[PDB]
Amino acid sequence: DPTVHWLFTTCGASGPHGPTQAQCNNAYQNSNLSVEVGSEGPLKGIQIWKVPATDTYSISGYGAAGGKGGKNTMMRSHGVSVLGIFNLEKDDMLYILVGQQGEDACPSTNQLIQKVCIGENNVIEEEIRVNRSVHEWAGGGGGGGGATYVFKMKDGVPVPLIIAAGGGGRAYGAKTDTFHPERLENNSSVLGLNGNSGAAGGGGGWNDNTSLLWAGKSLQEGATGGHSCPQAMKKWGWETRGGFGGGGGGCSSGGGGGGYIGGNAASNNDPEMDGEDGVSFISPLGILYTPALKVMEGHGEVNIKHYLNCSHCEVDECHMDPESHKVICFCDHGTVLAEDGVSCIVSP
Ligand SMILES: *[C@@H]1O[C@H](CO)[C@@H](O)[C@H](O)[C@H]1NC(C)=O
Ligand SMILES: *[C@@H]1O[C@H](CO)[C@@H](O)[C@H](O)[C@H]1NC(C)=O
Ligand SMILES: *[C@@H]1O[C@H](CO)[C@@H](O)[C@H](O)[C@H]1NC(C)=O
Ligand SMILES: *[C@@H]1O[C@H](CO)[C@@H](O)[C@H](O)[C@H]1NC(C)=O
Ligand code: NI
């Protein structure tokens, strides 16, 4: 029977740059999936996937998380989840960027930075106490998480379909969350610009002119993660770079997360100001499944499958027979479908 499940990952790649063709070939080897990875220009690191047949598809993409801070090691800002149902034609070309996680501050392979991570270096803390702010020993806030982009080409112009925002960069010192909401855009005339970049870099938007090195670049520019603070270097070896997919570079403050509209970062290197999560987007073409919650940690991914309405099942996981079109609630992970037709149970 034909294949209905397709899972796109970072192909084992991490950082501000995307995966290679060899990385994705090795990742999808022996799996029922093959893509062509871009190697030059703004498509470098983006996976091109050929639609096998004209049908209805569920495109659910998850953004990447930001990087941990240095002092508190408080848990990351997770990525945004977006799920959409689209009508696609055979041989259509989907362009899929899988956002990569922003660089964690700790641990570090640099010996002096590691002394700051384990806490046996009080230079940053005594600089905040005495000098009242960080301008000398800056850095330590993780870079912004790269966003996940799934877009199309129509008459020679990129058309976005699903953009899952990237998580904001956790600042160096952070014992607070404030649980910001996750924005989502549907009307396309709203400009998908970058996030505001201060000392730390802002997130990369959909299409903008990124002029700052530490800022994450937009999707149509390559979506490369930004560098760290110029002051974070030349004093430390501190590199907290934004993830691939518009992730903003890191400073003592957190870098902004990429998305349709880049996440805004701190403007004056605030050691406690995290980076804002990016702005997600879904095309007017297509139906929204579940509002844009933030769930997954680590790298992002994209799950595309032949759309089936499995809402009657207890868990929304069901498959359809290709010939007889008999839909059955999919269970098997060690379980067997119960007598009520839904709600899988453990058999043996
Ligand atoms: C604050 O004062 C001066 C300003 O540059 C600087 O030399 C000093 O090292 C700073 N304080 C600390 C604790 O670093
Ligand atoms: C667009 O998204 C916003 C934020 O999720 C929502 O409030 C608004 O109703 C949406 N508009 C349409 C037409 O779906
Ligand atoms: C999108 O928003 C702009 C203003 O924000 C408005 O002028 C335009 O008509 C909107 N597009 C649609 C399709 O509603
Ligand atoms: C899925 O099927 C249910 C009935 O089981 C229906 O109420 C719902 O509107 C359907 N959803 C979609 C997106 O077709
Ligand atoms: Ni958030």
Ligand code: NI
């Ligand atoms: Ni590094």
Ligand SMILES: [Zn+2]
């Ligand atoms: Zn179908």
